[PDB]
From a paper:
Atrazine chlorohydrolase (AtzA) was discovered and purified in the early 1990s from soil that had been exposed to the widely used herbicide atrazine. It was subsequently found that this enzyme catalyzes the first and necessary step in the breakdown of atrazine by the soil organism Pseudomonas sp. strain ADP. While AtzA is a hexamer that contains one essential Fe2+ per monomer, TrzN (which is ∼25% identical to AtzA) is a dimer that has a single Zn2+ bound in each active site.
The hexamer was confirmed by DLS and size-exclusion chromatography (SEC), consistent with previous reports for the solution state of the protein. The ‘cavity’ in the hexamer is approximately 14 Å across at the entrance, with one residue in particular, Arg163, forming much of the surface of this entrance. Interestingly, four of the amino-acid changes conferred by these mutations (Ala170Thr, Met256Ile, Pro258Thr and Tyr261Ser) are located in the interface responsible for coordinating the AtzA hexamer.
Author numbering:
A (entry chain C): 2 to 474
B (entry chain D): 1 to 474
C (entry chain A): 146 to 310
Write the structure that this text describes.
């Protein structure tokens, strides 16, 4: 089958950053097969034409690091808490209380919001894969929906005895909420992840991948991380790890996590680290040396009161730094455009420098650079011949995006996230004129009421306070 | 005597006890909120019209504590990447100068369209282009028609700051084809012009329009000029406002901070609203606090222009009246209270390394009741209470991004994008309903945006400004 | 004498094993001076303080009061502090606690004493904290939120080289 997108302005993010006025894209069997300018050439015939007249075409946004299921915990229970407080009084207990049919709803809700905001690829860091039936429920929905998914199966094989007293104290804040452990033996995790990979890697028409995800340098053994590193190598994928997200996660064995990893030969080009807030000049240098990929969760770092990562420092060194929305419930939106705006501003403010990151650069982080940070830049991230047809159409014909001249500036500094109109993933039309293929408008309101209801019930089961009393101070 | 009933909504009152009233109603008459009740306990009065707010959240209209409207036509490429003075002299002044009155009218309608769409009902317009002939008239006609509540803070400059000349000339060399402009005026001329403007327009459009004097800054205005403004505000029971310490080149007037300087001349009082408190120290905060000075924080813009981060939590923890302003239409670059609230919440959490430095409730208060306080208008607006004006907004949380929702303040601040506002009432008048704008109907919307686009492009040609600079990654 | 007195009876029901090595070193400065412990079992302290209160609270013509005084967040159990908090509430008096007077004190369980107290619901309007030298913006905010009362020992904070609150 074939698809022709016509009369659009193509923001290619290609090698030369070409922006092509009144131009077309020809799509076939999920691939971009040709591009042209309408004034200079005629588009090939195609089964279907999408008229993009007066519209902007981008590569699909890439959510470099996120956590999907937790989305059902937003809306009151999740805010106001430092990382570990949030983790132990909200995230773990809340996830535990979730049944597979709840997970299926979470995933569809997440995807609905993501696609609406132009997101076509999702790096799902899955902390609830340990619970039976959850994987199957989730994968069914990811497949149906048509999104491109990296499923990074997290594991924990090591107790951090150092932070026990801290956690017990934190638990006392909500002593009605259970203290949970999702630890598992090293060999069990290997088996479970290998099985998951064998079964689901490459499925849904190449749209689903599986990676190993040792949780952190303090919650995973050296043997565990080495296994993940080797696994990634052997299977031509990536491995990923949360690195230094709180000041209690700071020093492992008298050194930084990056230092510790360097000691054990654990920093390589197939590693994607997330959360670089507690980083120093040396840590950056180490990651740079080994071509480590990065995902910056800028909004979440603020939400959880962690701080501000040295993104400009990394970007200035040509490192592959993508943007991640992080948890559905540490943001609390799944909106790349809103997060791009935030990435642009937070760094300008802190560096007291209005040009520390150009909107072009922010846009690159969300697309081509993000693809790079997933090791997927040969397949996605730009409008180029040979690459997958992961494409999005923006309509700037709205008050907030008027006027518009410079497209990157307009998207980063003006757009709210509701201006995406049509979304293609792997050549499939997943959204058209804001009508979602996997959640049609006649079914939308009922679905949101189901999600609301299930969320409420999840919180009851977990004994979590949904709506705390009005508090000004 | 005509009446309006809003029914079956959840009322987020921001009243004295912060009441949140499930399945409740509001009765409106002659622009005023005349009663409230809970549906289970009482029956709403009969009314000429009923608005069903079933499954919806009712808030006091958002208050934009400090903004600049006309500049909105300069967004979209020309305005970003520049420190405050660079932006000011290479973009704002020349761009504004190139604007004709018909251009201004379009700018104001575009601004208002976006503002009302995002739940903004009251706007503190700091007008730097009021010096040009025909501009005031054009703008006021539109503000009036549109039905928004407006404070028109007429800015003036009566003093050259000779210290900063060489700096500005160097900045101008960045865009040398763009003209260096001056909007300075003699103290007495400014007084006359502002007094005339006040006499003519204060209280017009059914009480919706006010006029304040706005000495630009402590370095661009004489003591005589600031004292006049201070006295004027007092005599006419309004406020006066001043931009204070927005860049590191301002941070010291005559060997002291602007706040210190103002203190020396008895220029800090309860009718003053200062904007931009980035370059503030402990002592400055203390001085403002002592005199009950009102504040407007332009958090997004302070970031956009690379100024930095103001000590908002410090001021709020002292019970000071701090409102939220979007600032310039072209130093944000949106007119979206909800997006800016989110940013206020996050930037301060990040910088203070403290997830609870400002509750979402508190952020929401800044946007509503506290904002009203910062405009000296908290007796008239900012909360859903009997006696106050019917400036009200209806939010629909039945969208993916705002699902689930339990705690309404958290949901609005951390989840909402700004497109969830449905119906907007200003002074009892229906200004927007199911996202249909009364002053810009959908059948006329696209053509209007194309007009705004064109005019913008033309304005930039006339000013010799680069609209779309070459792609730049570093 | 006729003076008005609040008699805040201090108690310690918990060993802080983390700083023994540091204390042994300090003791070597004056080795002929004996190392002392005034620790007591939680229940013993309760009894002793309750008895003291029953006997002396309101005496000398209303001039004498008695409060419970858990020594610090590191030298007192959560159970001990909760008791003192409850006791103050039940008998319409206050309870008091030394908080963060040296740099060896200012973490308890990976957080500030005020943070730790907040976790256990231990900051209230009947609490009077003493010694706020090692305090940050957040600690101040927490105390403010709960209307905690404060006593500043400015001269002493200097004398002992602690610093400035
Ligand atoms: Fe994470
Ligand atoms: Fe301003």
């Amino acid at each position: 089958q074939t698809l022709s997108i016509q009369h659009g302005t193509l923001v290619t993010m290609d090698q030369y950053r070409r922006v092509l006025g009144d131009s077309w894209v020809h799509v076939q069997d999920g691939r971009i097969v040709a591009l042209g300018v309408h004034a200079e050439s005629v588009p090939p015939p195609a089964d279907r034409v999408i008229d993009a007249r007066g519209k902007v075409v981008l590569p699909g946004f890439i959510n470099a690091h996120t956590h999907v299921n937790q989305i059902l915990l937003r809306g009151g229970p999740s805010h106001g808490r430092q990382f570990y407080d949030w983790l132990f009084n909200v995230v773990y207990p809340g996830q535990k209380a979730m049944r597979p049919e709840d997970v299926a709803v979470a995933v569809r809700l997440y995807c609905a919001e993501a696609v609406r905001s132009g997101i076509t690829t999702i790096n799902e860091n899955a902390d609830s894969a340990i619970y039976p039936g959850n994987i199957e429920a989730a994968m069914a929905v990811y497949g149906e929906v048509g999104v491109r998914v990296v499923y990074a199966r997290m594991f924990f094989d090591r107790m951090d005895g150092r932070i026990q007293g801290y956690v017990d104290a934190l638990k006392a804040r909500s002593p009605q909420v259970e203290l949970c452990s999702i630890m598992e033996e090293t060999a069990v995790a290997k088996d479970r992840i290998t099985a998951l990979s064998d079964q689901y890697h490459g499925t849904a028409g190449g749209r689903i991948s599986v990676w190993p995800a040792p949780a952190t340098t303090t919650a995973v053994t050296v043997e565990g991380m080495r296994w993940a590193q080797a696994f990634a190598r052997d299977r031509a994928v990536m491995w990923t790890l949360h690195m230094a997200e709180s000041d209690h996660d700071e020093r492992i064995h008298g050194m930084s996590p990056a230092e510790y990893m360097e000691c054990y030969g654990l920093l390589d080009e197939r590693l994607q680290v997330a959360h670089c807030v507690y980083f120093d000049r040396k840590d950056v240098r180490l990651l740079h040396r080994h071509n480590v990929k990065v995902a910056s969760q800028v909004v979440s770092n603020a939400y959880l009161g962690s701080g501000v990562a040295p993104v400009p420092e990394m970007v200035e060194r040509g490192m592959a730094v993508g943007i991640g929305t992080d948890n559905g419930n540490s943001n609390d939106s799944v909106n790349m455009i809103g997060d791009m705006k935030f990435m642009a501003h937070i760094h300008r403010a802190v560096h007291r420098d209005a040009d520390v990151l150009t909107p072009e650069k922010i846009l690159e982080m969300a697309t081509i650079d993000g693809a790079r940070s997933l090791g997927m830049d040969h397949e996605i991230g730009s409008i180029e011949t040979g690459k997958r047809a992961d494409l999005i159409l923006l309509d700037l014909r709205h008050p907030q995006t008027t006027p518009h001249h410079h497209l990157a500036a307009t998207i980063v500094f003006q757009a709210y996230g509701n201006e995406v109109d049509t979304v293609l993933i792997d050549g499939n039309v997943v959204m058209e004129n804001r009508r979602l293929s996997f959640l049609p408008p006649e079914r939308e309101l009922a679905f949101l009421e189901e999600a609301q209801s299930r969320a409420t019930a999840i919180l009851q089961r977990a004994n979590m306070v949904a709506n705390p009393a009005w508090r000004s101070l």
